[PDB]
Design a binder for this molecule. Structure first.
Ligand SMILES: [Mg+2]
Ligand SMILES: [Zn+2]
Ligand SMILES: [Zn+2]
Ligand SMILES: [Zn+2]
Lengths: 171, 112, 557, 107, 84, 97, 268, 178
DNA sequence: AGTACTTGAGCT
RNA sequence: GACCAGGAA
DNA sequence: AGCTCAAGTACTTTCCGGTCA
């Protein structure tokens, strides 16, 4: 998981920036546009690596307006979860339906029904919890989940998880 | 080759009979164009316009719909190297002024 | 303007022509396309979920599109589809369809010949797609049987098998929109002796084309991805959206639908007759009645000027306007809408010549100077001069018409309450008037020369004629016996550059047409320059002094 | 190279490509009476070696598609015994440059 | 895929069209309040500013010349001769 | 006024490429469409505002480009599609030469 | 038809002339690489004349008391007499001009001497004279080497193609062949010193101007000669009115590549 | 406009099939083992176990702040506070995913110290296991190789219960403390 | 407006 | 707006 | 019946009053 990935990004620049702080404003606009981005294709583009060697290349003057398009070649750390991947995470929310678990940038939600049967919902607890013969699961606790499937919304991926199978659960 | 020769010769004579002078290069080009193919290629609907230039291009002279119909049925792929294609597409053509690209050089932009 | 889109802006690199597989048409379709009625939710003015917009494009000009949400200027069309009750020939490929049947076995779908014949394997190797199809066709048209066993290519005593099927191949002739066959037969090995005579149905030809092998059809002009032969036959009919066939709606209580909307209506109707006719008690000929009829409309919708007689005509007599007809040029989409256009920022009027203009300028009537605009960007260089013109106004001469704010929104100095207290900001645009020494394109048609359109310096002047230097008269072919001339005005900094640097009158003087100058001294000035320079001709001091001063360069000596 | 008076029967005509790699050319005697290559209008054609050709193509960055073409049956092509793919270099006099290089490839 | 500068073969002079596009492009850019690399010595017309940038070879642009085959030579407007 | 076929030639003669485009686009017809990067047609339902795109049936919610062509061509292409011919439009090449 | 048939032809950045298919039409544009505008009729002296007076005009014999440059012509005159080594130079110089004379007579069979070439040399030398107030008396300060090798050099600077390889290099030679003839015929030693009467500095200038003007005279990659050529032929076809069919309908006949022409005719 | 890669794949019309991603080690196209860097040369897939990851972002974010000052001239919970400031100096703040991440990474790393990670990296990258597995093994703490091969099903026959149980033991040694 | 190609049909 | 018809440098 | 042709077809510029849903 948690890959480093070679990527590129076309960026147009208004002529008014064709001054010597050019590569400067470029590398920036890259980090604006790309860093913190999340795409289905590559996942969460987390941190742009190696600022000092970003590839500016030569930029082409577009022909009707005078802006110049650069393909900025770069590389960065990304995070793209998968089905069947096992993740360690922290509980964030908890409800009569299940619990959400924070795994880096993304949340994995575990259904009431994707747990063991004995683990059950305690509405009357602060903060609201899931209790077992021997386990307690609530907002601060740490969980180990099997990612059962992922869904890619706009600037996020969410995913449904399970702790029913072996060696998964509280830790 | 000798065909080309005679071909020019006769074309030159049409122009020069009327008295006018046209520079060699222009007649040469036309004449050369008819010729390079392998023999005499008519400057007509079913002559030059049947070569393997762009579908869209050829379609802009004489056989328009008939051409595009064929273009689809044989899955022609238009290069878009032609003038006319770009004219149809609203793109600047590779024509004079468009025959080449223009880049900023960040380097020299900092040197000055 | 037209609105901002986050989508990446590119240029077309390749155009890849192909054929619609039905599946694709069903797939792009934002609606079928079920009812011949245009709209009128039963008389109630508003579109019917059935023809134009059951999600398609939009009418109304208020009231935005119901798929994208965007309204006329922005929303292109959106395609619909009608499911055809029976397969039908695309009129354009009846041609090719026939020739393919002539090439392949009309029963099994094997190519009639292969690498077992030699001329065949030689045509097969022809690099050019189109040419090879022709080379193949002439070979295969003769072969009148799907042969099972072939003399091998080592010795013709032991006959190697190729593909199955014995079946004789029909001889095929077109009977306008119908393809009909004629099989040799046998009967005591005679025949014919009156051969078998039936008509090839779409559906069968279709099935044969389907069975045609990927490698086989690929040897014919085709492409397994972008155009399979089966797709020369129509089962799913893409329905173009209103912007292609817009209802030109005079006043309000009167539609005025487009010719195509009608032809589709017909197709729709013709399709419903056929559909219910077979789903019901099918009198098996009244079926092939409506079959033919559908095939006809779907034919004449694409092409109505067909060789085989009748011309699908509007009630009135006026024949219907086929899509084909819209395209065949000199007027007509390709030639007259694309290779040429009517254009903005242009003007024309009577010309007359001027002995007092300089060669490369053109006298522009103040009236036109005041109409014609140049989009100038607010900049520190021009900011005051620009503000001056704006305050100056649009009815005044050297003035301006519109101010365009950063927010892409347009200010009309003709009306805008703030047309006085209008305060320019760097980066806005003032569309100002055409002013002295703006480079412009002057052009006298017909335009057979480079030199027939040349860049000139503007000189705004009175009276209503374009005035031009007498010596530039000849490369335009112009005489003042009433001939008008067009003037176009560039809008970009880039384009004026192009004009002044490439096609300015002075540049065009010596010309590659004939390696000589293409304009010179003419008329009065010529007639006079002779008289002037005789030996006889002398000039007194009084006059000489004027003649000298008149030369605008003169060292004053 | 068979030089025949009147005709060669289509029977015999079949035996012509029948012994590769050897190539066989038929020429009508009556044609060969005047040498067309000596005509005023008929400039120097020169057969290029494979090596020679590869270089032409390289130095002009060309696919064979892009080269001007001589038909295989072309009178001069026949004289030189051009086989398809072979390229000839044509040297002509120029009223513009004096001498001029040109190439045609065989169809 | 671009030819190395030491193997360039095109004219080392600048072509009518190259120049017209260079002048036009800069003038556009100047018009759009881009940085000017010259003393506008009372200049105010983006073309004339550009004609002046060109006259002093301080235009930070590059012509990319394409060959029929697709390859190319990049030339600095610095290094192009302007006897044009 | 008509910037006709011949007026075109004359500019091509001049090699005045941009001015040609200006006259053919900004001085007239010019228009913007969104196209799919898979199938090459104007299919895309650009809800450009909620910033959503999609060429359903290509299922492509992601690979979308915008282009500036003359409406007449936009028409011409719809007209061809209407007549079962697909003039697919592509923003990258493959062939070279 | 003409325009539509040639529209996509243009000169590319390698001087090649191609269409949208990148097929070669001319290898060098107009067989000569020159832009049509930069060209004027110009008389190739060398081609005509009696062999008698050709010689009188061009031959220098430093080995012969009557055919030397009289020392009035240049300062070296008195000491140049009998100089064998120099004579080898003039002997190339002359042997070349003669070569050229035969060559030109192979090209222009009729003897026609005027032909449109780039760089009007006549005017250049005129300017040289009026620019440098050349004294149609006092002797030049040129050497035989100055003149002979100056021209030999200037020739190598008339560039039309550029590549570093034999095909391209040869192509360049071809392209330049005719102009070079013109050049050598106008700048032969005797001619320079006796007729034009140039001083060293004048000649130097004349050479430099020639080179420049020549360089000016090549076509600019991008030039759309397709439409240019068509238009250049079609437009004069607009101003149009043994008896062989001629004018407009013969032109029609030709472009059509008509099988059945009106006035077929052999000319034996 | 958005982000592209180096996988030049030209999907001409043929939409589908989009093979599902599982740890049957069928990750994306964008993540097969044969990758290609901007020298065009084929390079192998890069995966990080957190810590290997934490150290990459930390490092890059650091040498980024170094440039932010250059150009301007003319205990885990205790690292959390440290890191939180580094984001405030190099990160555009809106990027709350990085902050969310550096939290998690800081609190879930198995190897706090540089060398220690290199040691892990050595140990695993020698099993020839697919980079994904090699990552997950550095990321997920395990004992019974039953445990291991259950959470990382993709392993299985790839390496013996014993060998993998050896490795696993070595990992728990390097398991840096807090 | 005359030539193009291509269709068509009639005759031996 | 189709379409038809007539008349101009 | 097929196969030859002559005789059949459609197709090859810029401006500025009527009838048709
Ligand atoms: Mg007139
Ligand atoms: Zn819509
Ligand atoms: Zn069969
Ligand atoms: Zn699509």
């Amino acid at each position: 998981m948690f890959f480093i990935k070679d990527l590129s990004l076309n960026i147009t620049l208004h002529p008014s920036f064709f001054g010597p702080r050019m590569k400067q404003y470029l590398k920036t606009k890259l980090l604006e546009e790309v860093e913190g981005s999340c795409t289905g294709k590559f996942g969460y583009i987390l941190c742009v690596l190696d600022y000092d060697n970003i590839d500016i290349q030569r930029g082409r003057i577009l022909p009707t307006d005078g802006s110049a398009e650069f393909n900025v070649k770069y590389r960065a750390v990304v995070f793209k979860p998968f089905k069947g991947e096992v993740v360690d995470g922290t509980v964030v929310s908890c409800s009569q339906h299940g619990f959400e678990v924070q795994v880096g940038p993304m949340k994995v939600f575990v259904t009431k029904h994707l747990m063991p049967q004995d683990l059950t919902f305690n509405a009357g607890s602060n903060p609201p919890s899931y209790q077992s013969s021997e386990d307690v699961i609530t907002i601060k606790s740490r969980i180990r989940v099997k990612i059962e499937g992922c869904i890619s919304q706009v600037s996020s991926i969410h995913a449904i998880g399970s702790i029913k199978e072996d060696y998964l659960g509280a830790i | 080759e000798a065909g080309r020769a005679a071909l020019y010769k006769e074309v030159y004579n049409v122009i020069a009979s009327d008295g006018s002078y046209v520079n060699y290069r222009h007649m040469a080009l036309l004449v050369d164009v008819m010729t390079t193919q392998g023999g005499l290629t008519s400057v007509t609907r079913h002559g030059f316009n049947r070569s393997n230039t762009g579908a869209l291009m050829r379609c802009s002279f004489e056989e328009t719909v008939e051409i595009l119909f064929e273009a689809g049925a044989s899955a022609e792929l238009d290069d878009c190297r032609g003038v006319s294609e770009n004219v149809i597409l609203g793109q600047m053509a590779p024509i004079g002024t468009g025959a080449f690209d223009v880049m900023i050089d960040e380097e020299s932009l900092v040197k000055y | 303007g037209q609105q901002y889109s986050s989508a990446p802006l590119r240029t077309v690199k390749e155009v890849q022509f192909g054929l619609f597989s039905p599946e694709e048409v069903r797939a792009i379709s934002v609606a079928k396309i079920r009812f011949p009625e245009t709209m009128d939710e039963t008389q109630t003015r508003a579109k019917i979920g059935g023809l134009n917009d059951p999600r398609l494009g939009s009418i109304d000009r208020n009231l935005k599109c119901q798929t994208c949400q965007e309204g006329m200027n922005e929303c292109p069309g959106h395609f619909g589809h009608i499911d055809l009750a029976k397969p039908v020939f695309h009129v354009g490929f009846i041609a090719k369809i026939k020739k393919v049947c002539e090439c392949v076995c009309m029963h099994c779908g094997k190519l009639l010949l292969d690498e077992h014949n030699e001329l065949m394997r030689q045509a097969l190797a022809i690099k050019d797609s189109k040419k090879r199809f022709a080379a193949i066709w002439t070979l295969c048209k003769t072969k009148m049987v799907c042969e099972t066993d072939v003399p091998s290519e080592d010795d013709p005593t032991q006959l190697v098998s190729r593909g199955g099927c014995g079946n004789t191949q029909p001889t095929i002739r077109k009977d306008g929109l119908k393809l009909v066959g004629s099989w040799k037969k046998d009967r005591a090995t005679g025949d014919a002796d009156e051969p078998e005579l039936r008509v090839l149905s779409t559906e069968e030809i279709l099935n044969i084309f389907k069975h045609i092998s990927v490698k086989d059809f690929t040897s014919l002009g085709f492409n397994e991805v972008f155009s399979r032969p089966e797709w020369m036959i129509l089962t799913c009919l893409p329905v173009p959206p209103p912007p292609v066939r817009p209802s030109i709606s005079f006043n309000e209580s009167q539609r005025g639908e487009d010719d195509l909307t009608f032809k589709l209506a017909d197709i729709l109707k013709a399709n419903i007759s056929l559909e219910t006719l077979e789903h019901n008690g099918a009198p098996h000929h009244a079926i092939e009645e409506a079959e033919s009829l559908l095939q006809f409309h779907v034919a004449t919708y694409m092409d109505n000027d067909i060789a085989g007689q009748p011309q699908a005509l509007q009630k009135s007599g006026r024949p219907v306007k086929s899509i084909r007809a819209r395209l065949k040029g000199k007027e007509g989409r390709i030639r007259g809408n694309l290779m040429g256009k009517r254009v903005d920022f242009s003007a024309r009027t009577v010309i007359s010549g001027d002995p007092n203009l300089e060669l490369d300028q053109v006298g522009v009537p103040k009236s036109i100077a005041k109409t014609l605009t140049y989009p100038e960007v607010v900049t520190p260089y021009n900011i005051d001069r620009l503000t001056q013109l704006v305050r100056n106004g649009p009815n005044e001469h050297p003035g301006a018409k519109y101010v365009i704010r950063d927010s892409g929104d347009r200010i009309d100095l003709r009306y805008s309450k703030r047309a006085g207290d209008i305060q320019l900001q760097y980066g806005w645009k003032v569309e100002r008037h055409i002013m002295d020494n703006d480079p412009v394109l002057f052009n006298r048609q017909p335009s057979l020369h480079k030199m027939s359109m040349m860049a000139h310096r503007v000189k705004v002047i009175p009276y209503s004629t374009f005035r031009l230097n007498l010596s530039v008269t000849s490369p335009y072919n112009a005489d003042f016996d009433g001939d008008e001339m067009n003037l176009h005005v560039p809008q970009s900094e880039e384009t004026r550059a192009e004009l002044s640097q490439l096609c300015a009158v002075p540049l065009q003087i010596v010309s590659p047409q004939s390696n000589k100058p293409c304009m010179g001294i003419v008329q009065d000035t010529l007639c006079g320059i002779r008289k002037l320079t005789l030996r006889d001709t002398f000039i007194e001091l009084d006059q000489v002094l004027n003649m000298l001063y008149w030369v605008p360069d003169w060292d004053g000596v | 190279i068979f030089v025949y008076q009147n005709n060669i029967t289509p029977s015999a005509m079949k035996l012509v490509p029948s012994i590769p790699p050897a190539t066989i050319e038929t020429f009508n005697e009556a044609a060969l009476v005047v040498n067309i290559t000596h005509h005023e209008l008929v400039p120097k054609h020169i057969r290029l070696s494979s090596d020679e050709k590869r270089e032409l193509l390289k130095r002009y960055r060309l696919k064979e598609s892009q080269l001007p073409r001589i038909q295989r049956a072309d009178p001069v092509a026949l004289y030189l015994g051009l086989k398809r793919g072979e390229v000839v270099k044509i040297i002509r006099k120029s009223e513009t440059s004096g001498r001029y290089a040109s190439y045609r490839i065989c169809m | 895929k671009a030819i190395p500068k030491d193997q360039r073969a095109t004219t080392p002079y600048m072509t009518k069209y190259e120049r017209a596009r260079i002048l036009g492009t800069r003038a556009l850019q100047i018009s759009m309040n881009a940085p000017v690399f010259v003393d506008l010595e009372g200049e105010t017309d983006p073309l004339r500013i550009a004609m002046k940038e060109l006259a002093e070879k301080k235009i930070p642009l590059v012509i990319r010349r394409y060959l029929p085959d697709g390859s190319f030579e990049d030339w600095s407007v610095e290094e192009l001769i302007v006897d044009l | 006024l008509r910037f006709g076929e011949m007026e075109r030639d004359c500019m091509i003669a001049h090699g005045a490429a941009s001015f040609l485009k200006e006259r053919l686009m900004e001085a007239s017809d010019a228009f913007r469409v969104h196209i799919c990067g898979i199938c090459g047609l104007m299919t895309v339902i650009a809800k450009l505002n909620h910033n959503q795109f999609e060429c359903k049936g290509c299922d492509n919610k992601i690979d979308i480009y915008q282009i500036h062509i003359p409406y007449a061509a936009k028409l011409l292409f719809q007209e061809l599609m209407a007549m079962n011919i697909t003039p697919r439009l592509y923003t990258d090449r493959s062939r070279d030469f | 038809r003409l325009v539509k048939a040639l529209e996509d032809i243009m000169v590319h950045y390698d001087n090649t002339t191609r269409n949208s298919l990148g097929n070669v039409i001319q290898f060098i544009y107009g067989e000569d690489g020159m832009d049509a505008a930069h060209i004027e009729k110009q008389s190739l002296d060398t081609i005509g004349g009696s062999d008698a007076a050709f010689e009188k005009r061009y031959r220098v014999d430093l080995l012969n008391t009557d055919h030397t440059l009289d020392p009035s012509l240049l300062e070296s005159g008195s000491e140049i007499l009998g100089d064998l080594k120099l004579q080898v130079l003039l002997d190339e110089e002359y042997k070349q001009l003669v070569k050229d004379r035969k060559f030109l007579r192979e090209v222009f069979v009729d003897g026609e001497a005027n032909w449109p070439l780039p760089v009007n040399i006549r005017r250049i030398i005129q300017n040289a004279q009026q620019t440098f107030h050349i004294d149609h008396t006092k002797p030049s300060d040129l050497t035989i080497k100055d003149i002979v090798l100056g021209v030999k050099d200037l020739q190598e600077n008339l560039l039309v193609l550029r590549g570093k390889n034999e095909i391209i290099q040869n192509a360049q030679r071809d392209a330049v062949t005719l102009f070079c003839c013109l050049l050598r015929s106008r700048l032969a030693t005797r001619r320079v010193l006796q007729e034009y009467r140039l001083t060293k500095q004048a000649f130097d200038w004349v050479l430099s101007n020639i080179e420049a003007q020549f360089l000016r005279s090549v076509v600019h990659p991008g030039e759309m000669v397709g439409v240019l050529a068509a238009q250049s032929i079609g437009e004069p076809a607009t101003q149009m009115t043994k008896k062989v069919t001629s004018g407009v309908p013969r032109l029609k006949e030709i472009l059509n590549v008509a099988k059945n022409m009106k006035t077929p005719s052999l000319t034996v | 406009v958005s982000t592209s890669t180096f996988q030049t794949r030209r999907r001409r019309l043929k939409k589908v099939e989009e093979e599902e991603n599982a740890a049957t080690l069928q990750l994306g196209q964008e993540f097969q083992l044969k990758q290609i860097n901007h020298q065009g040369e084929e390079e192998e897939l890069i995966a990080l176990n957190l810590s290997e990851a934490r150290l990459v972002i930390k490092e890059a974010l650091v040498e980024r702040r170094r440039a932010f000052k250059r150009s301007q001239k003319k205990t885990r919970e205790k690292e959390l506070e440290s890191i939180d400031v580094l984001l405030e100096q190099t990160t555009g703040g809106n990027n709350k995913d990085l902050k969310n991440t550096m939290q998690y990474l800081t609190n879930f790393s198995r190897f706090r110290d540089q060398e220690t990670v290199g040691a892990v990296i050595q140990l695993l990258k020698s099993t020839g296991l697919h980079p994904f597995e090699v990552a997950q093994l550095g990321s997920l703490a395990c004992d019974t190789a039953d445990e291991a091969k259950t959470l990382i099903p993709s392993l299985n026959n790839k390496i013996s219960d014993d060998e993998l149980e050896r490795i696993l033991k070595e990992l728990s040694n390097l398991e840096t403390l807090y």
